[PDB]
Amino acid sequence: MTATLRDAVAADLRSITEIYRESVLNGVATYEETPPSEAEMALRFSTITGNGYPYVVALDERGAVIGYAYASAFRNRTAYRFLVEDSIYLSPEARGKGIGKALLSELVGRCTALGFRQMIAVIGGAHPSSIALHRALGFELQGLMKATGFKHGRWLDTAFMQRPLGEGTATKPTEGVYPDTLYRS
Amino acid sequence: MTATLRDAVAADLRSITEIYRESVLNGVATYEETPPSEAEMALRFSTITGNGYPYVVALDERGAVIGYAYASAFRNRTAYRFLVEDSIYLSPEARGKGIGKALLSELVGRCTALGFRQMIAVIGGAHPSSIALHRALGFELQGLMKATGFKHGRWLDTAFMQRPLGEGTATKPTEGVYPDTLYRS
Numbered sequence: 001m002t003a004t005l006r007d008a009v010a011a012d013l014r015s016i017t018e019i020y021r022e023s024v025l026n027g028v029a030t031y032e033e034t035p036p037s038e039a040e041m042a043l044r045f046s047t048i049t050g051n052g053y054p055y056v057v058a059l060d061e062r063g064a065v066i067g068y069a070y071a072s073a074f075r076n077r078t079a080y081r082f083l084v085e086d087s088i089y090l091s092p093e094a095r096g097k098g099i100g101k102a103l104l105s106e107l108v109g110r111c112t113a114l115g116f117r118q119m120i121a122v123i124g125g126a127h128p129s130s131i132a133l134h135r136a137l138g139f140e141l142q143g144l145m146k147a148t149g150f151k152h153g154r155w156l157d158t159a160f161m162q163r164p165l166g167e168g169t170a171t172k173p174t175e176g177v178y179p180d181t182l183y184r185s
Numbered sequence: 186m187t188a189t190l191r192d193a194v195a196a197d198l199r200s201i202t203e204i205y206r207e208s209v210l211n212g213v214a215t216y217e218e219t220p221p222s223e224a225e226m227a228l229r230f231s232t233i234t235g236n237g238y239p240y241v242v243a244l245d246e247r248g249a250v251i252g253y254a255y256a257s258a259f260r261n262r263t264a265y266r267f268l269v270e271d272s273i274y275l276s277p278e279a280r281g282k283g284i285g286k287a288l289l290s291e292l293v294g295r296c297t298a299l300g301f302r303q304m305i306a307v308i309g310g311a312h313p314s315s316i317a318l319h320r321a322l323g324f325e326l327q328g329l330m331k332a333t334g335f336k337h338g339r340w341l342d343t344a345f346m347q348r349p350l351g352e353g354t355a356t357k358p359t360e361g362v363y364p365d366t367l368y369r370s
């Protein structure tokens with residue numbers, strides 16, 4: 001079924017927190033070890049959305065949140081302001097249903113519309129399903145940082161992939177409008 | 186001539202701040218746009234050194250600070266705790282004298298002794314001179330993230346390089362001794 005997506009709101013916090021918790025504990029998509037609290041997750045949500053970045057949820061047929069995705073800074077230094085990084089997390093039972101691709105497509109589309117110019121994915125563990133998802137939406141593998149993570153008793157590689165957004169490098173950004181207005185002080 | 190290095194102390198912050206300011210304003214090694222104040226640099230120094238990472242200066246023949254370098258996290262998430270990233274800043278007068286090599290040698294050696302297992306360099310602008318410095322110290326180019334920075338009116342590439350440290354990926358780290366103790370909670 002075509003996925004059901006909408007922007008995240010505060011009321012989605014429990015589901016977001018629990019989905020992320022499961023990934024923290026069981027996976028290598030995230031290199032965090034201790035699940036954040038809901039209050040920490042709330043700070044992160046407020047920070048991401050306060051910077052104008054998209055933060056979306058996927059819903060099941062009853063309207064319940066079953067996955068989420070957001071864009072944020074790669075690094076919040078000024079010169080990186082036209083670059084975003086994607087993060088995508090689905091609850092286990094929502095996997096294998098095309099929802100990851102819907103979420104990534106949504107982040108790509110939103111960030112293009114908003115005026116960003118490049119997107120990077122930092123793929124924990126170089127997880128093959130995650131690489132495949134990104135490749136299908138036009139990301140290219142840029143490097144493999146070997147044995148950079150250590151989790152679940154093993155060394156992990158970290159893959160870096162990139163996709164241009166919109167005009168990419170072909171034009172200069174529009175001065176004085178979002179996202180050129182990010183990280184200026 | 187052999188470089189004169191020592192660990193940084195609080196009394197070096199004024200000089201460190203001035204060196205970094207020149208880099209912020211005139212270079213693309215750093216993607217920061219506004220020079221930090223000495224107070225801000227001092228907080229950064231406190232944080233880096235509070236995490237046990239090495240922070241060093243290079244001196245001229247009279248003892249004045251003419252460059253500095255430190256290791257710190259690539260990202261401060263648990264699974265990255267055995268990975269460090271190097272940062273090196275030379276005043277204009279310190280360039281072309283083997284001082285970058287000495288600083289990087291010190292970071293590599295220190296982080297090897299401390300028990301880190303990989304070092305990454307994230308090279309702003311992909312400047313060939315910085316790439317070559319790192320290559321000379323055994324780093325290999327891992328990828329080039331194109332048009333990821335925008336500074337001084339230009340799209341900038343960002344190069345990623347990596348060197349193993351010590352045992353690298355060949356052994357599991359010893360539990361409960363630094364740097365296994367970083368970022369745990």
Ligand SMILES: CC(=O)SCCNC(=O)CCNC(=O)[C@H](O)C(C)(C)COP(=O)(O)OP(=O)(O)OC[C@H]1O[C@@H](n2cnc3c(N)ncnc32)[C@H](O)[C@@H]1OP(=O)(O)O
Nearest residue numbers: 029087088089090092093095096097098099100121129130
């Ligand atoms: C930069 C990034 O954010 S990369 C994504 C990082 N996030 C995660 O890894 C979180 C956990 N995984 C997920 O959220 C998703 O599976 C994604 C985002 C990686 C991919 O989106 P999906 O819509 O599942 O796409 P797709 O069907 O192609 O995924 C196949 C993966 O889901 C697993 N899967 C499929 N159906 C199920 C199910 N019912 N229960 C549990 N797992 C399932 C598959 O086994 C496979 O994972 P594997 O390669 O480890 O075996």
